[PDB]
């Protein structure tokens, strides 16, 4: 069955995007601060405000790192995407 369904392709993009940046520096299966910021700034610019407080980014990084190893693995990356989608749904629901 060629031409994968929209949601299947969406999941594909979500998975590949992680390894697109995690496979640049340090751990090939984890994201550091720099890699995560590259992923955010490049792959999700529509979600970034006009300006970016570095402290809020540090708090974000700290909140995503659930097991406290100074990096974000695929699971925590997933909870991040989940948060983004939940924001979008907040804007969808009421309005």
């Amino acid at each position: 069955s060629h031409m994968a369904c929209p949601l299947e392709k969406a999941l594909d993009v979500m998975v590949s995007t992680f390894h697109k940046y995690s496979g640049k520096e340090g751990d090939k299966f984890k994201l550091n601060k720099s890699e995560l910021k590259e992923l955010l700034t490049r792959e999700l610019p529509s979600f970034l405000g006009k300006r970016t407080d570095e402290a809020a980014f540090q708090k974000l990084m700290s909140n995503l790192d659930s097991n406290r190893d100074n990096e974000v693995d695929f699971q925590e990356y997933c909870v991040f995407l989940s948060c983004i989608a939940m924001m979008c749904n907040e804007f969808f629901e009421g309005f």
Partner: protein, 338 residues
């Protein structure tokens, strides 16, 4: 088989079934607040009859840079400029207030300058207000921004609409190259300046305007304050009275405004507000411009001087002279009662 694996994963995740702990930080980093504000504003606009109440409640209760964020988000979402949408949706003075708030301080000052110099006539009162009240930093940014918003320099348009020593004064001030505050008092220069200012006007049959302009545009504000107080030793009239006797018209008004700012800028704006609401009707232009331009500068000090001098709060007079969402907006900019 997929269900098996999914169940294993779900057990790994647990039933943490409250808004996830990182959600707050995510909202914070992405500036969720600005997006929500933007969407609420658009909803208020598209609402039949226009929901001005929400527009006021949001926009007059955000800092200027926050308003810039909201404008950014609004443009990204609606594909329409917030200023244009609100321009279409609003009218009367409320429109000028909201549109005024949407600009950065430099942009607002520049637009007000061009507005004062627009047409065959000229609102030299507004021009005088801005040019005499703004600091060096503010004036430099105002120049840089004015040169980009419009095709020409500020000074060029200034010397194209004014004339004489009034022009000389306005240009000198707009240069924004006033001497900064000094750690040294230099009492000799103070006495010499004061006595020079006396010998330039009152004692003379005429008046030496160039010396006046030079002294009152080049010297620093504290130095000029001490000079003005030393002036009371040589002249039977203080600086303001001396101005009122030596020169008439726009030059007189300019000098008076300048000295007022130098001596006590917040009191200057307080008196200007009081005058704006004093008599029949309202000088809405002045009131709006001051409330917008000083809301995040020295509004507390302005309110303090105002209460001190006139017995009742700025809030009181604003409430008494204006009504409706316009009034609500102005009161919001005020920041509370005194």
């Amino acid at each position: 088989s997929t269900v098996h694996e999914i169940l294993c994963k779900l057990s790994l995740e647990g039933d943490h079934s409250t808004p996830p702990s990182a959600y707050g930080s995510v909202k914070a980093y992405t500036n969720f607040d600005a997006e929500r504000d933007a969407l609420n504003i658009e909803t208020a606009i598209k609402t039949k009859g226009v929901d001005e109440v929400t527009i006021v409640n949001i926009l007059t209760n955000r800092s200027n840079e926050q308003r810039q964020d909201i404008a950014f988000a609004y443009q990204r979402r609606t594909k329409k400029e917030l200023a244009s949408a609100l321009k279409s949706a609003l009218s009367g003075h409320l429109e000028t207030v909201i549109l005024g708030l949407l600009k950065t301080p430099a942009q607002y000052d520049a637009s007000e300058l061009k507005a004062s110099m627009k047409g065959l006539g000229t609102d030299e009162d507004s021009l005088i207000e801005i040019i005499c009240s703004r600091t060096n930093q503010e004036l430099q940014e105002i120049n840089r921004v004015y040169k980009e918003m419009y095709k020409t320099d500020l000074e060029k348009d200034i010397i194209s609409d004014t004339s004489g020593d009034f022009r000389k004064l306005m240009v000198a001030l707009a240069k924004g190259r006033r001497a900064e505050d000094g750690s040294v008092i230099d009492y000799e220069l103070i006495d010499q300046d004061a006595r020079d200012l006396y010998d330039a006007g009152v004692k003379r049959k005429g008046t030496d305007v160039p010396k006046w302009i030079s002294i009152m545009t080049e010297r620093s504000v504290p130095h000029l304050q001490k000079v003005f107080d030393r002036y009371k030793s040589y002249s039977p009239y203080d600086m303001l009275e001396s101005i009122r006797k030596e020169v008439k018209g726009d030059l007189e008004n300019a000098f008076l405004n300048l000295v007022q700012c130098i001596q006590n800028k917040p009191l200057y704006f307080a008196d200007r507000l009081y005058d704006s609401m004093k008599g029949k009707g309202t000088r809405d232009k002045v009131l709006i411009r001051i409330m917008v331009s000083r809301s995040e500068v020295d509004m507390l000090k302005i309110r303090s001087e105002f209460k001190r001098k006139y017995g009742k709060s700025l809030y009181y007079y604003i409430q008494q002279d204006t009504k409706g969402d316009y009034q609500k907006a102005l009161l919001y900019l005020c920041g509370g009662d005194d």
